[PDB]
Amino acid sequence: VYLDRKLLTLEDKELGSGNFGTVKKGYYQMKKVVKTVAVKILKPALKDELLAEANVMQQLDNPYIVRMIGICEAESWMLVMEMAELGPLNKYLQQNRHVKDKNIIELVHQVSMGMKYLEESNFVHRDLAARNVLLVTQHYAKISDFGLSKALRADENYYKAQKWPVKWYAPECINYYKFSSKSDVWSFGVLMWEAFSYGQKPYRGMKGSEVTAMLEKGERMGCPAGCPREMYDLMNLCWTYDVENRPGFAAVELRLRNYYYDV
Ligand SMILES: c1cn2cc(-c3ccc4cn[nH]c4c3)nc(Nc3ccc(N4CCOCC4)cc3)c2n1
């Protein structure tokens, strides 16, 4: 699973940035052809997180999850993934306002199919958000950034923690530090919110502690100008306060599969 630095070229246009360091476009010389890749380049432990991300990515084989080519012990540590060229789903819709809405259903479904796969595989993402949905084509998205993910113990249905996208986290993650596919389901509702908001941030202006209060009050995000009906009704079901009543991806994909067909 290790790669030859010499076989890898990096364009200077940094693709983006995060705590680990930067991500650059690059090209990796394969058997015979070259592959366009996106490469996480690691700038005091971030390493372990990165290899954790690669470990997870290494066991995932599914059409709606970004594929990892390998790792490169080169100048810095590098995680090389197959390139999703259109990039993050939020930034994209932020400047493709006039994208149909029926196109979005098909997209969030794919997300849910990838997320089902992840549920069944008993892995929890823990950072599910539109920004982590990468576009291959305008009609093909994949889930990325498994830096927080965890493989679940065979004996439990949740991971328990000992810096958080609070606005994407379910109440139980915040109250008890408990992360399950159901928590990912909550996030998937915030993701759907974003998508159907053509990339608007959720809970605009609010602080985490204030988002936390609003949800406990039984309040949820308003419907985004233009969203269909069931899609908002799906969001609210995803945002079920009680874990055990909240639908799993098995369920949420199932409904998702249909609704689209009828559009
Ligand atoms: C496969 C795995 N990937 C990971 C990341 C990526 C980029 C930045 C960050 C920051 N934290 N994690 C990241 C992952 N980005 C990928 N592709 C991608 C494609 C296009 C852009 N854009 C195009 C528009 O202008 C801004 C940059 C951008 C990206 C991609 N394809």
* DSSP state string for 23-79: EEEEEEE-SSSEEEEEEEEE---HHHHHHHHHHHHHH---TTBPPEEEEEESSSEEE
Measured between alpha carbons, how far is 121 from 130 in angstroms, rounded to an integer?
21
* 193: nearest Cα among 91, 92, 108, 97: 108
CATH of the domain at 50: 3.30.200.20
Sign of CA dihedral 167, 237, 152, 40: negative
Interatomic CA distance for residues 173 and 166, integer angstroms: 9
- DSSP state for residue 129 in the 8-state scheme: S
CB atoms inside a 10 Å sphere around CB 201 = 15
Question: Which DSSP state fits 2?
Answer: B
Q: Are residues 124 and 168 in the same domain?
A: yes
DSSP per position, 141-179: EEE---SS-EEPPTT-S-EE-----GGG--HHHHHH-EE
CB count within 10 Å of CB 172 equals 19
Longest dimension (CA), the chain: 59
Q: Are residues 18 and 39 in the same domain?
A: yes
Active site residues: 127
Q: Which residue CA neighbors atom 7 of ligand 1 most closely?
A: 16
33 with 93, same domain?
A: no
d(CA 160, CA 165): 16
Query: Among the atoms of ligand 1, which is closest to the Cα of residue 147?
Result: 12
Same domain (yes/no): 229, 168: yes
C-alpha dihedral over 95, 222, 215, 158, to 10 degrees? -50
Ligand 1 center to residue 244 CA distance, Å?
Answer: 35
Pocket test for ligand 1, best of 133, 134, 136, 143 (most atoms within 8 A of CB): 134
Q: Tell whether 79 and 132 lie within a shared domain.
A: no
Let me know how long the chain is.
263
Distance between CA atoms of residues 79 and 51, nearest Å:
8
Residue that finishes a domain, picked among 83, 103, 125: 83
Fill in the DSSP letter of residue 204: T
Cα–Cα distance, 226 to 205 (Å, whole number): 22
Amino acid at 5: R
Are the C-beta atoms of 179 and 126 separated by less than 8 Å?
A: yes
Q: How many CB atoms lie within 10 A of CB 152?
A: 17
**Distances, alpha carbon 253 to alpha carbons 8, 113, 123, 173, in Å:** 38, 6, 17, 22
Among 26, 57, 83, identify where a domain stops.
83
| Ligand 1 atom nearest 144 alpha carbon | 2
Tell me the three state secondary structure of residue 230: helix
CA separation for the pair 129, 166 (Å, rounded): 11
- Nearest in space to 143 (alpha carbons), one of 124, 161, 156: 124
Q: Of 83, 112, 138, which one is at a domain's C-terminal end?
A: 83
Binding-site residues, ligand 1, Cβ < 6 A? 15-18, 23, 38, 66, 81, 83-85, 87, 134, 144-145
Regarding whether 49 and 142 lie in a shared domain, the answer is no
**CA angle centred on 181, ends 41 and 105, rounded to 5°:** 80
Same domain, 122 and 95: yes
Same domain? 72 vs 143: no
Report d(CA 82, CA 80) in Å as an integer: 7
Strand partners, 21: 18, 42
The domain in which residue 67 lies consists of 1-83
> Is residue 5 located within the same domain as residue 54?
yes
Q: Burial of 259 by CB count in 10 Å (0-12 exposed, 13-18 middle, 19+ buried)?
A: middle
137 labelled as ligand-binding?
A: no
Which element (helix H / strand E) includes 80?
strand 77-82
Whether residue 195 sits in one domain with residue 248? yes
C-alpha distance from residue 74 to each of 11, 24, 42, 213, 224 (Å)? 16, 14, 11, 47, 46
CA of 176 to the centre of ligand 1 (A): 32
* Residue of 8, 13, 9, 34 lying closest to 24 (CA atoms): 13
Q: What is the DSSP letter of 95?
A: T
Q: Are residues 165 and 247 in the same domain?
A: yes
CA 261 to ligand 1 center in whole angstroms = 30
Q: Which letter does DSSP use for residue 197 in this model?
A: T
Q: Which residue, judged by its Cα, is nearest atom 27 of ligand 1?
A: 15
Residue nearest to atom 19 of ligand 1 (CA): 87
Q: Please, which experimental method was used?
A: X-ray
19 is known to lie in a ligand binding site: yes
* Number of structural domains in the chain: 2
How remote is the CA of residue 117 from the centroid of ligand 1, in Å? 23
Residue type present at position 43: K
- 182 annotated among ligand-binding-site residues: no
Q: Hey, is 243 helix, strand or coil? A: helix
Q: Which of 13, 14, 15 to mutate to test the pocket of ligand 1 (most atoms within 8 A of CB)?
A: 15
- 8 and 138 inside one domain: no
Q: What is the CATH number of the domain that holds 117?
A: 1.10.510.10
